[PDB]
Amino acid sequence: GYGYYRTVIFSAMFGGYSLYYFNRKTFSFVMPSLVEEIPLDKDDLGFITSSQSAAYAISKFVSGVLSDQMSARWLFSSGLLLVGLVNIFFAWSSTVPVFAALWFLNGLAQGLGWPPCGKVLRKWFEPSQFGTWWAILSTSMNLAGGLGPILATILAQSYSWRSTLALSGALCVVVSFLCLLLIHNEPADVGLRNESTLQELLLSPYLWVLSTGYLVVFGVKTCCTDWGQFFLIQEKGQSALVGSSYMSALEVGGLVGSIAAGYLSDRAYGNPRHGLLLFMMAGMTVSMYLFRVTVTSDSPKLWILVLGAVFGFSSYGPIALFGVIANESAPPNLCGTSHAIVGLMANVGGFLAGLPFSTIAKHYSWSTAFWVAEVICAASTAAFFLLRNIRTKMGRV
Ligand SMILES: O=C(/C=C\c1ccc(O)c(O)c1)O[C@@H]1C[C@](O)(C(=O)O)C[C@@H](O)[C@H]1O
Numbered sequence: 001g002y003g004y005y006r007t008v009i010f011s012a013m014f015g016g017y018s019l020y021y022f023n024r025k026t027f028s029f030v031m032p033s034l035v036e037e038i039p040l041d042k043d044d045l046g047f048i049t050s051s052q053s054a055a056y057a058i059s060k061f062v063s064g065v066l067s068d069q070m071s072a073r074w075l076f077s078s079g080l081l082l083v084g085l086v087n088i089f090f091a092w093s094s095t096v097p098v099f100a101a102l103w104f105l106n107g108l109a110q111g112l113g114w115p116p117c118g119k120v121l122r123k124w125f126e127p128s129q130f131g132t133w134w135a136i137l138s139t140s141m142n143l144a145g146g147l148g149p150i151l152a153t154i155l156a157q158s159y160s161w162r163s164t165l166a167l168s169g170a171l172c173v174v175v176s177f178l179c180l181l182l183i184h185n186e187p188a189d190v191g192l193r194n195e196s197t198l199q200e201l202l203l204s205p206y207l208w209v210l211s212t213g214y215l216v217v218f219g220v221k222t223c224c225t226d227w228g229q230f231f232l233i234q235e236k237g238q239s240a241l242v243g244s245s246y247m248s249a250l251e252v253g254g255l256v257g258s259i260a261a262g263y264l265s266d267r268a269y270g271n272p273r274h275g276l277l278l279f280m281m282a283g284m285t286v287s288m289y290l291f292r293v294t295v296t297s298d299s300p301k302l303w304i305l306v307l308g309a310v311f312g313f314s315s316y317g318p319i320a321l322f323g324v325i326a327n328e329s330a331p332p333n334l335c336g337t338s339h340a341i342v343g344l345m346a347n348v349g350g351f352l353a354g355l356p357f358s359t360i361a362k363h364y365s366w367s368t369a370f371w372v373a374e375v376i377c378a379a380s381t382a383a384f385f386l387l388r389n390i391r392t393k394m395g396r397v
Pocket residue numbers: 130131132134322323324326327338339340341342343346
């Protein structure tokens with residue numbers, strides 16, 4: 001029976017990939033309480049996040065390159081176990097070098113679990129149904145972003161910050177074991193039946209336009225999430241519950257954005273679905289400007305929630321659009337390399353959000369850094385609008 005095994009395996013990957021993201025973002029979930037008991041400046045936080053981002057970038061790139069000669073279940077279980085172990089260790093350390101080393105290892109382990117999902121999806125599902133399943137997998141990510149912050153704060157009001165990560169880590173370990181028991185690599189182990197050149201790929205302007213757009217979008221999203229959580233409390237006179245609700249609403253909006261963008265793009269030199277992407281980017285920068293300027297010490301909370309949801313929608317739509325367009329325009333025999341390059345550029349964009357942004361905020365203010373980010377986003381949107389009727393097919397032409 002294909003259906004039974006498909007359902008079981010997909011549920012197992014859903015749970016494992018949700019725990020992956022939860023343990024990845026636990027630091028952003030608890031950061032305010034940890035800063036409250038251990039006095040730290042913005043530079044230390046930026047250093048830790050940048051170290052994790054760099055480690056994840058290198059590990060994911062190399063694992064994606066060499067994934068063709070490893071088993072999916074073992075890699076998934078190993079990665080989950082290592083992430084749980086480093087999360088458990090994090091709950092006992094109380095210094096800035098140990099935190100940075102532990103999160104570097106966290107990124108290294110988190111980079112391992114990406115290729116197995118694609119391998120299982122390709123082995124167990126039809127080639128014409130990849131993206132759809134990809135889509136729902138992305139929703140799991142958003143789910144981990146939604147339940148994470150608020151619960152953490154709810155636990156923080158009566159328990160230590162160190163009593164959450166540790167518990168989370170334990171869960172991962174247990175789930176990892178269940179994952180190995182519940183994941184089969186191919187529909188044959190159970191028993192039931194189963195051009196261009198590299199010099200021409202990198203010499204395509206559209207390949208760099210897409211990469212730079214993804215870089216900008218990912219960096220701006222990471223900046224908004226972590227440093228707006230801190231911005232709402234440290235400068236706008238709001239409490240930590242509002243800071244957590246802002247991120248929860250951001251992820252709630254991002255879920256519906258990721259779900260819808262595929263439908264709107266599919267119903268609709270250049271690409272047919274560039275207008276939706278440009279509109280979403282414009283909405284993202286407009287919402288950023290409104291959030292920076294309108295919110296004061298005395299403002300209703302459902303205005304902040306609306307701003308967060310709108311930004312999440314306008315940020316998570318373009319990510320799916322970028323992925324689908326990169327898959328569609330890729331050379332016929334170089335899809336994996338193109339996906340790896342675009343992911344690497346998105347990861348370096350996310351890396352740029354940690355330390356330089358925190359240093360700018362430390363020197364001038366949070367407002368100045370957010371204004372710089374919004375200015376960069378507006379300039380990128382204008383440039384993308386200008387550079388939109390160029391060749392979209394990459395390769396030997
Ligand atoms: O391949 C994909 C994504 C979707 C995809 C694949 C085959 C398809 O046939 C399809 O319709 C859709 O990679 C994802 C997007 C990524 O940014 C990229 O594409 O560069 C890299 C990484 O971030 C991944 O999340």
